[PDB]
Amino acid sequence: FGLLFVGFVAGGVAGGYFWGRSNGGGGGASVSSTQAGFDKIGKDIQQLRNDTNAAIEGFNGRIAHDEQAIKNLAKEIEDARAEALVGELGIIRSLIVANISMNLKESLYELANQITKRGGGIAQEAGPGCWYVDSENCDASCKEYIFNF
Amino acid sequence: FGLLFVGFVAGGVAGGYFWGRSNGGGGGASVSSTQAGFDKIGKDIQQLRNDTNAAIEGFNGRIAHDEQAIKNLAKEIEDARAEALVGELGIIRSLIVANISMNLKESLYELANQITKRGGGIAQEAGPGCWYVDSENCDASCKEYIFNF
Amino acid sequence: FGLLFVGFVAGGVAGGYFWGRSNGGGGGASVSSTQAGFDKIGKDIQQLRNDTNAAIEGFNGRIAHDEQAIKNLAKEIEDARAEALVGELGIIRSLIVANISMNLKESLYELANQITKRGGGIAQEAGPGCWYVDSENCDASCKEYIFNF
Amino acid sequence: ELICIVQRVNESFSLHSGFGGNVYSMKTEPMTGFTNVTKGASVINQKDWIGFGDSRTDLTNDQFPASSDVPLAVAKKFRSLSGASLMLSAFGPPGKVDYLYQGCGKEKVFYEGVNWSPEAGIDCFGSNWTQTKKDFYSRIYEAARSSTCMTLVNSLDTKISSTTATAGTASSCSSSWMKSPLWYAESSVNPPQVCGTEQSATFTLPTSFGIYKCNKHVVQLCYFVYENKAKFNTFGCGDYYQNYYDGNGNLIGGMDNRVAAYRGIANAGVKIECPSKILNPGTYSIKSTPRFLLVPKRSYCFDTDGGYPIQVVQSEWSASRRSDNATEEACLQTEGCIFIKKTTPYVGEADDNHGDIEMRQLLSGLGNNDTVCVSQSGYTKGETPFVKDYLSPPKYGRCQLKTDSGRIPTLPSGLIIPQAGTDS
Amino acid sequence: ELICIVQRVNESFSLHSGFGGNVYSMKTEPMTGFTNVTKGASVINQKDWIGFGDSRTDLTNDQFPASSDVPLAVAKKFRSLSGASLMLSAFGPPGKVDYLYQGCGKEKVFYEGVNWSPEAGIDCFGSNWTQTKKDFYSRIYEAARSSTCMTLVNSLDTKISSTTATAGTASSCSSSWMKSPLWYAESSVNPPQVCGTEQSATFTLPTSFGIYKCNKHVVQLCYFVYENKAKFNTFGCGDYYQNYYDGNGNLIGGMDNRVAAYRGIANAGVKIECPSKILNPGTYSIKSTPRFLLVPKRSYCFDTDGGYPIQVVQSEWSASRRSDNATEEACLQTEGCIFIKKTTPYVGEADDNHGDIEMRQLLSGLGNNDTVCVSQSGYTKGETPFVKDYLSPPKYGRCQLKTDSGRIPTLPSGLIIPQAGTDS
Amino acid sequence: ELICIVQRVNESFSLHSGFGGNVYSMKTEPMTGFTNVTKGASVINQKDWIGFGDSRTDLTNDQFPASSDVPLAVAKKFRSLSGASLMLSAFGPPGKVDYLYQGCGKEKVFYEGVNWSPEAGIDCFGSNWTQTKKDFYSRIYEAARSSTCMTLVNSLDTKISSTTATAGTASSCSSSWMKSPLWYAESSVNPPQVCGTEQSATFTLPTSFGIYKCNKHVVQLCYFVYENKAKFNTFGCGDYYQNYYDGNGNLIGGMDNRVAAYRGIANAGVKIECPSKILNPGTYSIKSTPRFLLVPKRSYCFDTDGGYPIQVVQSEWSASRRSDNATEEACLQTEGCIFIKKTTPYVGEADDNHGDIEMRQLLSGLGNNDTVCVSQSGYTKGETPFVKDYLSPPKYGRCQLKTDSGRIPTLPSGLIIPQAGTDS
Ligand SMILES: *[C@@H]1O[C@H](CO)[C@@H](O[C@@H]2O[C@H](CO)[C@@H](O)[C@H](O)[C@H]2NC(C)=O)[C@H](O)[C@H]1NC(C)=O
Ligand SMILES: *[C@@H]1O[C@H](CO)[C@@H](O[C@@H]2O[C@H](CO)[C@@H](O)[C@H](O)[C@H]2NC(C)=O)[C@H](O)[C@H]1NC(C)=O
Ligand SMILES: *[C@@H]1O[C@H](CO)[C@@H](O[C@@H]2O[C@H](CO)[C@@H](O)[C@H](O)[C@H]2NC(C)=O)[C@H](O)[C@H]1NC(C)=O
Ligand SMILES: *[C@@H]1O[C@H](CO)[C@@H](O[C@@H]2O[C@H](CO)[C@@H](O)[C@H](O)[C@H]2NC(C)=O)[C@H](O)[C@H]1NC(C)=O
Ligand SMILES: *[C@@H]1O[C@H](CO)[C@@H](O[C@@H]2O[C@H](CO)[C@@H](O)[C@H](O)[C@H]2NC(C)=O)[C@H](O)[C@H]1NC(C)=O
Ligand SMILES: *[C@@H]1O[C@H](CO)[C@@H](O[C@@H]2O[C@H](CO)[C@@H](O)[C@H](O)[C@H]2NC(C)=O)[C@H](O)[C@H]1NC(C)=O
Ligand SMILES: CC(=O)NC[C@H](O)[C@H](O)[C@@H]1O[C@@](O)(C(=O)O)C[C@H](O)[C@H]1NC(C)=O
Ligand SMILES: CC(=O)NC[C@H](O)[C@H](O)[C@@H]1O[C@@](O)(C(=O)O)C[C@H](O)[C@H]1NC(C)=O
Ligand SMILES: CC(=O)NC[C@H](O)[C@H](O)[C@@H]1O[C@@](O)(C(=O)O)C[C@H](O)[C@H]1NC(C)=O
Ligand SMILES: CC(=O)NC[C@H](O)[C@H](O)[C@@H]1O[C@@](O)(C(=O)O)C[C@H](O)[C@H]1NC(C)=O
Ligand SMILES: CC(=O)NC[C@H](O)[C@H](O)[C@@H]1O[C@@](O)(C(=O)O)C[C@H](O)[C@H]1NC(C)=O
Ligand SMILES: CC(=O)NC[C@H](O)[C@H](O)[C@@H]1O[C@@](O)(C(=O)O)C[C@H](O)[C@H]1NC(C)=O
């Protein structure tokens, strides 16, 4: 119900970020549009996952120096070593994720201020992603100027 | 003074999340109620600490393969090894903590929108946990409907 | 443009947190003051970087036990070992940073509520750092009381 | 009216720092704890392991499972016969049981040997079989930590030069002799006017045995002990001697008197010492004092292909019978070995000698599908990386590590308040 | 009208937990993958490595680069001569090429030896040169894993007591003899009424060679083989013998018949065995049966200053000529060594014998500025820490680790929705 | 009027990426730095360590603390006597000081030996005591890295067969002899018509000494050196010989001329070489040429229970007196040992020979409650995990690691701006 939460859907139905509307003459039945051109997003998603590499290049560059002179493989040793290393990696993953998860959701919070500062304080922050606009002092191409839908 | 900060108390006095009120006829002396039934909380606190295990099960599953053929213990070795491992663990702890600390305080921020969106924009976000309600257009069982106290 | 973003400047020009103003008689050309005494800040920046040590003292205290009986240095071994350890450290760094970056920017969000709760709801949260004050019901030493500039 | 939700803590609330803010709470649960440890034997991989055993592991035994210390599922994993021992099968004393042990397994359990204790009352001029026993089983354990498989080699290629010679017998050795070593004599050698010719012999440690490959072989280079020259001369002439060289002619073992003193106990008369050397495969040469000759005839064949530390298990009798701990101290003085020891005596279910409760619960680990480490302190599963105490070597596997309980970090619980920022 | 932006996912959207909230998305890209592996030789450090070689690595060769398996840039890093081998230079058979190998490098490539195969048809009473060959090259590889440098020591300090003696020759050895060992004879020894005096000799493994320092030396303690005593007695008297002791008088090698049997193949007549021992520097003593004497004259000088595992490369001829794999099995049975093997035969560009495509692409790694690991499975760069399969030892460097593909973690991509909080 | 707080940076502001957003700032402080290193000796655990010493560590000395290089608190941790050395107590030359060293400690400091330098002018037919010295102290250091304790064994169990024999004396050895080895002679042996009977002897390396347990023993297998046979024959007959075998009869040391050449320096006349072998406990046999006999009588007793690398400290005299560096090179050529060396000469406070400033500050580490590592480069505390340069082995403890300063990560400071999101 607007940016801190994620809902689901069945059968067909696409997924993502869209545009919705609530009440009216008391009481309403809601109405959801079909996404805005929300292109600032896809520029950033493209930015972000292109940054991860920094840490990924870091993890890639670290291979420890070893020397066995022995003719037969040390397989438990090999795989303890491999298990430790995949272990360390799991952590790293978990952090890139949070590093996006936080930074993605920190820029979904750097788009919904663009929306709360154009028509303002008409907007009236119902927090983020969601707002309170009265059909009294803001209307129809005042609402195609602001939301972009 | 309302959700980004934590205060203390002396002697007896319980601790937690409560319900407070400010001014009046100019000027007021404050008034703090005795907790709401804030049960969404305790469902989530119960949820969250039941999630940690994912990472805890991960840390538990990683024990490295070794082989000594030697009859006398390698005690500094043992304890360097044990110290490294408790070391690694300290980090993990520190992260579950932040992973709650962030996610707990991200759902205390997923309760105070429920409060800012029922009576709205009567609420008038004095940020989170705190709000501005005038005794002009919202009164007494308009205030037992919203805050639930 | 107000607390989630950082701008730049050329030639001379100082850097930091300042004080700005927007429009007027339609339309305005902006006006930026020369910092407030924002001293709560520098107390906290001083607090915070004095906390890091906790983790830094932790990293410092962990040196593994070894024993070579050999007269000639194991240099690749030495430096694999040194590379692993600087590696581990890089991570730690990255986390103190986020631990500030989050906690600094969590207390820049614990100053701009002090500002949104003094003159309120005159303020009208244009989010954080930024707000909507009309020159109708709040004026000039109502504006030297609140912003402190 | 400004209406907040204030957070607040007591002198009973404690903070918890995170990397990303911190936390408040009155109580905590530890993140991890120790992992229980079980005394005894077990294995980390059920399909690569082999036991060698005796009546106590034999299912053919007319009295199973009362005569056994293991379940059947487990007993199937042993190469046992009732009354066998590795030692006897190295010597095959007259009227003993002669089982050709052969298995292949990385983890190896050894649970036999009691069937040659002093009680066996094997004579045959045995200097101190309990000695022979210890030195034997050591070279065995010495070679089985580094080997995958093992087989008895029940007949070695051999030849004597002397053609007049004949084969031994003793009142003391049930009126015949050992299967190994082989004993050759000269009728004519008469200390008193005849002293005969020196006998030669040779023998070959093979490079394989059937499907089993031989990198290393455990033999006995056996020689005679006499109180002195005078004692011996009543048979032979000058010094006694008996010597083992390789293909190059370097000397490995034996007992040549002409360079070292005599050491036979007073009036003990003739004895035999049977120390066990490990030799590579190959042809080895033998020179003896004319009248007598000794020759190694069996061996234990091992690979160098690798092994886990082994598990040697206490194989004595019950109180009533005369045992010894020669395989305990053999396991003790040898690298990568592991002893398994009862705290009580053996108390059998079929015999007095067969079916101990303590043993059955000891060896019950053998057993499970989920042992992950196996130390001299017993064996663990994979609950946690820690143990309350050190896991004592020899050990192998994902072995835990003793840390002090006070260092195991903890995690918040009960009532919990976040925190973030200096809050000022 | 309350106007939101609702986030929502499908049965085609999957969550991804972070430490700091989680994430939604339909697809993922792996964080890392495996690192390709290249068969053959290469080196991790280009300025500390040395090859020793032959015509196939020789640039002076009148036919380069058709006669070579390496580029020039690489050929400059070898100490080769056309027709050389380390073995020949240890013996210098009559009319062979006698190159004084000497280089210093941690990583060491050995790519020679074919210039003494059976095809060389070197006789000189060679018992089984292919044997001599294997035992030779092993001690070499045995000593070059632990050494930085190596040099041929082309003349050892030596002396004989017998002054009547003279030096050998064989129809079988092009009517002269080896450079090493040295062969001394007694004209007068006549088995049939004269048997002469025992000859002594001594020799000194030096502590250095020019700029090269000697901790350890690879020599041949050479002796004669006879079918039997009767065979030998037709020359000498009693047993044959030839013995090597150190300064203290402990015996290291040789062939003394008076303690071990004869072993000369039937009617083969006299032969020579040339097994290679590693000896410290120092003065060693020699006692022989009167008529003949043998003496070591060359050696290979190594330091103990350290080395990487070595890379031994398959050096046989083409199909048409008679080769052997004596340096393959030498590399196989020796620690820290690494063999390089062609899957096809050798097919030369100048000769049939010089210029193989497979080899050139094999040895092309030698080559690069960016090899980071070098295993018995070939060699890698530093893309990732993992390999699809195990890198087989011997290996050195930042060697990767085989993990299963299903364990390599992944990272979100395509459409991505955050998450945070219980959302309830 | 929209009224913001804009954040902004310069060309003097630099970003800092975190996992959870990033950061701005003009300056940074490093997270860690290097840890200072101190030359000399020290110990990581004060209650498990033992020094063995001399006047320079003796507090009974009538001149302490001017005669000492350590404080008292430290001097209490040594087993010293003024004028002692481990070597002398192995031999007890006539009129020397004969201190029975015995301590037990994992970390071991050795700070003695000067009390037998050439200056001691001990003769007694010493071939090259400085040689004897080096080979002695090496086996000592060789055995003390792997032992916990050490004690002088000041009397070994011994017996001679010959009953006519008598004990030695030399003008050269203050008209008596060594405490060890023991020297036995035959009056009657007359090269010129009498040559007497071969003497036998035996001796026993005990399995313990008082509270001290013996796994390994350091002895001298001493023999005589002669210029040649002719030289010797003016006493004995044929070759000289003197030989040590074990219980089995394998030969360990000695000097048998009948298989190796003579090596006595020209006209030096008779000498003695005293090389030190390490032997297990047990009874060892001795055969000598009839007129003379030599016998080991003392030893140094060690356990196999484990030890840290040892710390050997430079023990020479002042310039004026004739020293040597025989324990330096002994420490150098032996594993797990560590030398401590002065950059200047010794300049004493009581004597010229006792009380060096450099030494006192060198050995002052012994000293502290907080040394954490101890390398051949000196010793550190536990400030950081890094060192500016490598800590040179041998080393033990929480040893740091040399990293380049440019790799040590840093942390923001001064003015700091956060960041988060693409901000777009
Ligand atoms: C859930 O929603 C997403 C998008 O909202 C769906 O993904 C689309 O899939 C179509 C094909 O069916 C592709 O052509 C598009 O590229 C996708 N769109 C986007 C925006 O990624 C997905 O199929 C949906 N899942 C279900 C089960 O309906
Ligand atoms: C601080 O406050 C907490 C609760 O706000 C107190 O904890 C309560 O303790 C009582 C017993 O005294 C228990 O029966 C309750 O279960 C607890 N309540 C909660 C909500 O956890 C705590 O005792 C207080 N500390 C002090 C020093 O007053
Ligand atoms: C960017 O801005 C910062 C401050 O806003 C400048 O730093 C100041 O530098 C002066 C000297 O030029 C110092 O005396 C002050 O202590 C600094 N001020 C602060 C607040 O730190 C910095 O020089 C600017 N960079 C450029 C290129 O103009
Ligand atoms: C992350 O930063 C926070 C805030 O700077 C640190 O929290 C401090 O922790 C110490 C204990 O080490 C407390 O005494 C302080 O009161 C805390 N300060 C604040 C503002 O919360 C925390 O230590 C850091 N995380 C880690 C793992 O070190
Ligand atoms: C950090 O905490 C979050 C939230 O508590 C964890 O997210 C849960 O992850 C599991 C999968 O392990 C999901 O099934 C749950 O639905 C998630 N819950 C929520 C509220 O998001 C996450 O697992 C933790 N991070 C790590 C690395 O363990
Ligand atoms: C966490 O994510 C942030 C944001 O995606 C990364 O920040 C980028 O860092 C690079 C330097 O590596 C800068 O050049 C970019 O300008 C940064 N982008 C943004 C949007 O801040 C950061 O690298 C990640 N953390 C780590 C430790 O890699
Ligand atoms: C080869 C053979 O018959 N061995 C007998 C084996 O020792 C057997 O375990 C026991 O044999 C006995 O003579 C003995 O007391 O040792 C009688 C025991 O009842 C018998 N016990 C069992 C369990 O078989
Ligand atoms: C080691 C040795 O010299 N043994 C001699 C052996 O005891 C002796 O010759 C044997 O004496 C016996 O009384 C006995 O049974 O021991 C009768 C044996 O037939 C006899 N054996 C032989 C080979 O002579
Ligand atoms: C010392 C010397 O002249 N060595 C010749 C070396 O074997 C040389 O590679 C080849 O020599 C040959 O006699 C041979 O067939 O072996 C003729 C070959 O053409 C020649 N090949 C080359 C490439 O030089
Ligand atoms: C090992 C040994 O005894 N070799 C003898 C050697 O073959 C023999 O004396 C040699 O016989 C020869 O026919 C030959 O060429 O082999 C002629 C040699 O001159 C002759 N050599 C000598 C040294 O007598
Ligand atoms: C056993 C005994 O009396 N040893 C004397 C010991 O060397 C002593 O340190 C020094 O003895 C001297 O004869 C010497 O010059 O060596 C005289 C020195 O003054 C004396 N020095 C000291 C510090 O005792
Ligand atoms: C090693 C050896 O043969 N030593 C002989 C020894 O020097 C010689 O017999 C001794 O000669 C002496 O002049 C001396 O003091 O050296 C007088 C000694 O009494 C004499 N010692 C004996 C045992 O005869």
Numbering used by the authors:
A (entry chain B), B (entry chain B), C (entry chain B): 9 to 157
D (entry chain A), E (entry chain A), F (entry chain A): 3 to 193, 197 to 429
Paper lines:
To further evaluate the infectivity and transmissibility of IDV, we expressed and purified the ectodomain of D/OK HEF, and determined that it also uses 9-O-Acetyl-Sia as its receptor by glycan microarray.
In our IDV HEF complex structure with its receptor analogue 9-N-Ac-Sia, we found that the 9-N-acetyl group of the substrate was tilted up against the oxyanion hole as the covalent modification of S57 by arsenic blocked the insertion of the 9-N-acetyl group inserting into enzymatic site. The active-site architecture of the HEF sialate-9-O-acetylesterase is fully conserved in ICV and IDV HEF with S57, D356 and H359 creating a catalytic triad and with the side chain of N117 and the NH groups of S57 and G85 forming an oxyanion hole. The esterase pocket of IDV HEF is highly conserved among ICV and nidovirus HE proteins and could represent a potential drug target for developing broad-spectrum inhibitors.
